Ligand binder design. Structure first.
Ligand SMILES: COc1ccc(C2(C(=O)N3CCOC[C@H](Cc4cccc5[nH]ncc45)C3)CCCC2)cc1
Ligand SMILES: [Zn+2]
Ligand SMILES: [Zn+2]
Ligand SMILES: [Zn+2]
Length: 437
């Protein structure tokens, strides 16, 4: 055996299908039907009668289970030794090495090494935005001159044109009356950061963004929104991990500012317990920050951006609307999946059809969570040329949003819960991106 350890995958968390946001953690009790519809023990017993609509399926046909199934880790056999070894430990992928697995001992005994690993992070197609970010990170790393650090690769893996649609409450008030556009076009992008750790790629950062160009009507035009952020905390060295995140995030703001976007938007929202934003099965000791801590962290990152003469200034949404002399909810930027489109639906219902009644009160209530970042200020923003993106569209269904990658990771036991598993998951992720390309 490679190690002395007996290893297996932890059970993943499933949905309860009752409260539409309820989740079933590890070792919990739940009910299943056809392994498709799972129900919380509390939510299932708080059900009308026996018949449950799914077609009505009776509660008699449901399975009472505990979320404690442990799938053992897989082994691979050396085609010369016969030695059985963990697939994750030796990082053997059948697509990269279709000739069969040969252990390190056999390779050295015959004075050879594995064939070069195609489908690497470096060999992913590059972009102007990706090169811009990885130059910034690697230049910073050489300045710090830590011998433990490795080369960082940043690649944009998806780009497509989409639209966000105004929800029925806001649509009935402002869209049907002609006061607001019914949809806002934007380009979505997914990019990841990789670090070479002992000769092996490790994906440690991911990000999805929404970019609304000069074609977009107000109030969305020339604005960028960060849909989701995620990380795996195994960047080496640890003492430089936060700074690298700052380099990527500030670099993105610097890049879109150069392109002509005037404002960036960040919703400082930590994930719920047991929830994964981009990377499936985070390490158990990678703690989720509390909201106050996360807000201060973004402040520090933005403060550095201001000092670097990249970000002009930043304010919370409540302060921004006051300076913008906002009066109606139709003047607030409308982003896909954002907090505010959902809340404006609730605000109109409670107000009897008003888009202004509790607008400032709601913004003040949640002001510390929403950051409005001004990249271009004053007279310069009034007369800018059209935004032209030098990078082409990158069709990649696996990265059209965060759902496909999470599903693939769930379906293939691709965990990021440890360095070895995250390296195996990185290798599998890279192979998928190269074949789907
Ligand atoms: C102040 O401490 C931090 C500040 C920022 C981050 C970043 C990040 O990754 N965030 C910020 C939101 O909370 C942490 C999420 C990571 C995470 C941790 C544990 C379980 C999870 N499930 N899903 C996501 C997830 C995603 C790092 C780079 C960008 C900001 C991480 C920790
Ligand atoms: Zn092992
Ligand atoms: Zn539930
Ligand atoms: Zn061998």
């Amino acid at each position: 055996y490679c190690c002395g350890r007996k290893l297996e995958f932890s059970p993943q968390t499933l949905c309860c299908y009752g409260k539409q946001l309820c989740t079933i953690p590890r070792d919990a009790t739940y009910y299943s039907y056809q392994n498709r519809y799972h129900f919380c023990e509390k939510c299932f017993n708080e059900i009308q009668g026996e018949s449950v609509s799914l077609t009505t399926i009776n509660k008699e046909q449901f399975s009472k289970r505990k979320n404690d199934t442990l799938d053992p880790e897989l082994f691979v056999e050396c085609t010369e030794c016969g030695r059985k070894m963990h697939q994750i430990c030796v990082l053997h992928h059948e697509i990269i090495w279709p000739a069969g697995f040969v252990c390190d001992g056999c390779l050295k005994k015959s004075a050879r090494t594995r064939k070069e690993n195609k489908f690497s992070a470096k060999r992913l197609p590059s972009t102007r935005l990706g090169t811009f970010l990885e130059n910034r990170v690697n230049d910073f790393l050489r300045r710090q001159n830590h011998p433990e650090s490795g080369e960082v690769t940043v690649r944009v893996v998806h780009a497509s044109d989409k639209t966000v649609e105004v929800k029925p409450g806001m649509k009935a008030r402002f869209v049907d009356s002609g006061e607001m556009a019914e949809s806002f076009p934007y380009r979505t992008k997914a990019l990841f950061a990789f670090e070479e750790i002992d000769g092996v790629d490790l994906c440690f950062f991911g990000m999805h963004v929404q970019e609304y160009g000069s074609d977009c009507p107000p109030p969305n035009q020339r604005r960028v929104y960060i849909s989701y952020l995620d990380s795996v905390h195994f960047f080496r060295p640890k003492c430089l991990r936060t700074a690298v995140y700052h380099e990527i995030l500030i670099g993105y703001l610097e890049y879109v500012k150069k392109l002509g976007y005037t404002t960036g938007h960040i919703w400082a929202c930590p994930p719920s317990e047991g929830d994964d934003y981009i990377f499936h099965c985070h390490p158990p000791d990678q703690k989720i920050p509390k909201p106050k801590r996360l807000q201060e962290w973004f402040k520090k990152m933005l403060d550095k951006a201001v000092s670097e003469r990249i970000v002009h200034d930043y304010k919370d949404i409540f302060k921004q609307a006051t300076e913008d002399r906002l009066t109606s909810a139709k003047e607030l930027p409308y982003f896909e999946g954002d907090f505010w489109p959902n809340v404006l639906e609730e605000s109109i219902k409670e107000s009897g059809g008003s888009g202004s009644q509790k607008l400032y009160a709601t913004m003040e209530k949640h002001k510390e969570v929403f950051f409005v970042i001004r990249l271009i200020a004053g007279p310069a923003a009034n007369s800018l040329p059209p935004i032209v993106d030098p990078d082409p569209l990158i069709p990649c269904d696996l990265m059209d949003g965060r759902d496909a990658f999470l599903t693939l990771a769930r379906d293939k036991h691709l965990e990021f819960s440890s360095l070895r598993r995250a390296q195996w998951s990185t290798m599998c992720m890279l192979v998928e991106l190269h074949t789907q390309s």
